[PDB]
């Protein structure tokens, strides 16, 4: 299964329905396409949904719901994810694993083009996947549009013609930004499983999750904080795994939630501030869902750890 060929099905919908989605498609002088989903345009709920689905290599279903009840409790529009290709979609494609630095353009790149450039190499080793395709689709969290030199750099790294590169872009501080980041709820768990817990994510057979769409804050530092908090305080995840002899799934579940990290307990913006706006001072294990539920198909066991913390989410977003 090819993440670039599969994601191209959704890129084609985005391009055909650009006007309906409040996004803007441009062609660079070299033939690459840029799809502005939030820099100079508003984007839309559906554009955010489709952008997230392209980050996932087309190997997940993405929806926007309003979960929550007939009661006084706080509820928000939320992004739900379902995937039956959990390592490939979330780590082979969605993870923002490519540092894109060209002139004054700096952004983390996500999406299926990462599975042609193999960014980073160790992820593709561990999930035993690589793509083969003649087009490359990357999504970029950035406050400006990339130009011709960024497209050429991505083309060369992916081994494709630059006229076959497609770049989707939206700032952190946009609706599409809030949606795509909430849509990383499942990814934050599989990456913590792989990098921090040393759990083999090829064992995760199915996965789903949901996290709220953070309010959009025009300050990019504040938007980083509120969008991370959406996942960390508001996210729920469900992983269906096939354990093997010697695995300790109860420990994986207990270790996974954001609350197991050191420095947990404050809105991200405040954590990052306490840390001197420096990542060396931050436990990256904090980047994880609020709540983790794991069904081990090998034993029939169900584990539930963490919980959604509505008080900390409301603190983050500025409401009582």
């Amino acid at each position: 299964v090819s993440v670039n060929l599969e994601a191209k099905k959704t890129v084609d919908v985005m391009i055909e329905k650009a006007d309906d989605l409040n996004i803007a498609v441009s062609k660079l002088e070299n033939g690459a396409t840029v799809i502005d989903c939030g820099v100079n345009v508003a984007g839309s709920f559906k554009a955010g949904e489709l952008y997230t689905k392209v980050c996932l290599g087309g190997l997940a279903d993405v929806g926007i719901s309003i979960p929550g009840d007939l009661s006084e409790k706080f509820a928000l529009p939320s992004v739900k994810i379902k995937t039956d290709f959990p390592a490939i979609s979330t780590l082979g494609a969605q993870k923002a694993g490519w540092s894109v630095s060209v002139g004054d353009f700096f952004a983390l790149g996500s999406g299926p083009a990462r599975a042609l450039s193999l960014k980073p190499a160790e992820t593709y080793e561990e999930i035993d996947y690589k793509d083969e395709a003649d087009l490359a689709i990357l999504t970029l969290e950035a406050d400006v549009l990339p130009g011709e030199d960024v497209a050429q750099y991505i083309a060369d790294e992916c081994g494709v013609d630059v006229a076959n590169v497609f770049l989707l872009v939206a700032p952190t501080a946009s609706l599409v930004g809030s949606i795509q980041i909430a849509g990383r709820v499942v990814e934050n768990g599989t990456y913590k499983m792989l990098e921090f817990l040393k759990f083999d994510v090829k064992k995760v057979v199915h996965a789903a999750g949901i996290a709220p769409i953070a309010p959009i804050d025009p300050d990019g530092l504040k938007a980083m904080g509120k969008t991370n908090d959406a996942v960390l305080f508001g996210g729920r995840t469900y992983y269906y795994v096939k354990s093997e002899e010697g695995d300790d799934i109860a420990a994986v579940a207990a270790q996974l939630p954001s609350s197991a990290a050191d420095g947990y307990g404050k809105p991200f913006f405040d954590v990052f501030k306490d840390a001197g706006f420096d990542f060396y001072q931050i436990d990256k294990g904090m980047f994880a869902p609020a709540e983790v539920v794991i069904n081990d198909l090998t034993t029939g066991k169900l584990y539930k750890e963490g919980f959604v913390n509505a008080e900390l989410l409301k603190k983050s977003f500025g409401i009582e």
Copy 2:
């Protein structure tokens, strides 16, 4: 400039092709207009109600019917969810029931895209800076009987289209599609209150979403009006993403918007309407508003939340403990 009639026609064509699957009935009038019965002599269906509602929004919103996942003892009902990235155009340019249709003994409020050709009422279109241009007109009608040839001819003439290119969708208040389409007005009730009562410029609403329960169907048209209003006024949640300008007081828009800000809030609408001697004039029109309102001001990053979903009044309205 997007056309609400041409966009809604994509959904009308699915309703026509799938009419038997949807439990609705399409007829052709002798003057060539099309009538789509979604509840007068037919049962309609969940999907008919979804699609009816999408047509009322001009095709410029997504509409779903959710069955809530809530593993607790709390009361929960099937609900209508709305998402729109054209908020004033979809909800006010199309959805709002701004046309009083009175022809012989047929009387109903007309909603949907045809309003944006007949400009009903004029001030809405001036304030949202939108008018359609189309050679067909689609109107939905909350009525207990099917409209005939003269009603279609009147709508065609007011819309400046040929009557053969008129499409009328009809469902009683007291029907499944009536409860769905009125729950689907959850976002509209806030945008119209912003425009008409709070004098807020709704062209500043960039995105909007909302959800409201589907009221139980009561065969008494006056009781059905009360229960379906109550679904929004007590059960509706709304989410408005706005771009404020200097001098706006978004905190005050948020606080002023919910149904509970109105005088007379606090009883089922049937009882409010009766205590008021069944006359719309004795009613605070600010009462027609969502239960809960959340506003994200994109200009500042602020989040505001006002009002609340009132389960006790939904249960009282619907007759359950």
Copy 3:
């Protein structure tokens, strides 16, 4: 409306997208099609959704929602159903009313082929429906794939050529099993209406419901238990009915939930174990949704009976 012809629309998507859905399509030498949705394959969320839609004869919408609000409350991925053909979809097709026993293959058969073989006959009389079709589509809750003899038995019972038989199969203990059993939340109430309450289910005009996907347990008895429990402690239903003079809809509503049954209150596995693993000692009225909501369109009345029991769901699932 033909439940076989309508379900074939979904079968065709399952066939075309088999690799994308982690299911396996095979053809037997006699030309029948077997679609393995969980025996030797993982299946998927979308396979389970489409399997459940095929069980309902294509006459319902099925979704998988990822509920999970902003609170400490337990929430699980759940299956939602909406239907405007409630007796035909849930009893004429979905109900697992056909005992399939051929050699050492034993399973209950669900889906549209039941409306050709008329299994059982009384259901088709009471709902006033029968199909007419030249293909037959059956779903089977089984731990092994059926072979040519099972396909030929189905073909002959349904009056079709075996080359036009389609069998979908998944074990109880699989993702598709958990999904398709949670998808029976509305059927559990319509069957109990017809069989236990003697209520005429042709009066149900619309219906919807939702139940959680149970955790998958590889023990088939424990899987039977946990997937039952998803509906009987976790399921909500909504029936829109048209009562007539003489009907007592308040009594229907009160008598329908799982909690009105004898032996209610323990996870099903434990109920069943106490019963000596014998369906004779079990009140089958316990196979009902946890919560029942009825709107009587003739009167405008709303009734709500039963309730979701999150503590017993948690007990059943071991958390």
